[PDB]
Design a protein around this ligand. Structure first.
Ligand SMILES: [Cl-]
Lengths: 237, 237
């Protein structure tokens, strides 16, 4: 009978087209079935990089480190290389522009004990915050696979994570990336030197498709390759 | 001192382009200043038509008539003129396709006493539900102006309406109409033979512009005219 996970290697063409190497993982929520071009890489655990802003946001909200999505976190006045980082931000814009220093301050206020407890409660990756509490998702020991990202995102979608419903609704709002009359994408990018990510889901009228992709050494290719797979599968026009 | 409200009649060109007549009202949240092509019409009261799905959704959720945005309201099997109505819906798709019969069922469950009490607590228009409990926003006594729509929407945006924060967040999610890297639109269309509406807001990185437009005897002109004003004011590209 049918399998929970099927391999579709025709998606490799979308990586080959860009001389890229990576994995796309899709989960059809109605059918309760997943699809990927590479089942091995789909289960390979990598640094989450800025995809960690999803659980980090949830924890900061649930503990009151972030009061709501409108609270302003003032620029500390240090000029950094990414220009959009050198300004005041709220939760919405800090996630949109992947503003690392804003989330590093969240993480310090959360603190290591609560961060580790919350990641265990979330069943998140290898749950390992070794390193600095304000950088482990960038250069420490935490590792999460694409299928583990799907599992985490499905819990978030269904408000099943062990944080308040309010925290989950606000983070799903902050994840909003694109919407029109055909679909809604809620997602988060991530970039580290060796790995780039895009994880999230596509809401349709009568189904949800969760996705998690990563690729070696990326940036716009993360969304472009993912969208080529979504188009091939007729999920988006 | 500066004016809270200013009239810009140059926007009339976007109406007369289509041999149309109406009002657009804009509110700049950061500046606390409003702009309109027609100050008198901005404050005249009209039937809300399907813009009433915003307060109706809020009330149905707060009273538990609708449990959440996933609850399915099955098609009653009656083939109606609008094809997208002849199917099962949840709150998200019922608002997207303006599915009148789903919301009439909400209104019947809410009932006259609780509907009137809620609209009073919302300060919603003339607070008058005279007419049929399940059609007064289409052919009964309720009236609201464009500036009153703005004031109601600002309360919703800030979670200041009387109902639970949860109900307000769910309805703001259901109002999602369009999103990209430049802006987010949360809005609701309204149509009756007499009046057409588009009300909502545009979220930018560091500001939000509320809008309410109505126009005589309409359909796509509602959004098209509003966007021509937003483009003229450099709110959207
Ligand atoms: Cl949203």
């Amino acid at each position: 009978g049918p399998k929970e996970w099927q391999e579709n290697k025709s998606w490799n063409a979308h990586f080959t087209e860009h001389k890229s190497q990576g994995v796309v993982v899709l989960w059809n929520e109605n059918k309760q079935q997943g699809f990927t071009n590479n089942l091995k890489r789909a289960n390979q655990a990598f640094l989450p990089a800025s995809t960690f802003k999803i659980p980090n946001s949830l924890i900061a909200l649930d503990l009151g480190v972030v009061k709501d999505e409108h609270q302003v976190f003032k620029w500390d006045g240090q000029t950094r290389d990414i220009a959009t980082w050198n300004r005041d931000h709220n939760l919405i814009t800090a996630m949109k522009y992947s503003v690392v220093p804003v989330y590093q301050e969240f993480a310090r206020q959360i603190g290591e004990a609560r961060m580790s407890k919350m990641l265990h409660a979330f069943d998140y990756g290898n749950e390992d915050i070794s390193g600095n509490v304000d950088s482990f998702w960038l250069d420490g020991g935490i590792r999460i696979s694409a299928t583990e990202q799907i599992s985490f995102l499905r819990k978030l979608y269904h408000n099943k994570l062990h944080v308040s419903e309010r925290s989950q609704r606000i983070v799903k709002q902050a994840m909003l990336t694109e919407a029109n009359g055909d679909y809604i994408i809620r997602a988060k990018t991530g970039y580290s030197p060796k790995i780039g990510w895009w994880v999230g889901w596509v809401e349709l009228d009568d189904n949800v498709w969760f996705f998690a992709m990563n690729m070696d050494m990326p940036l716009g290719l993360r969304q472009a390759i993912t969208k080529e797979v979504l188009k091939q599968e007729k999920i988006i026009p």
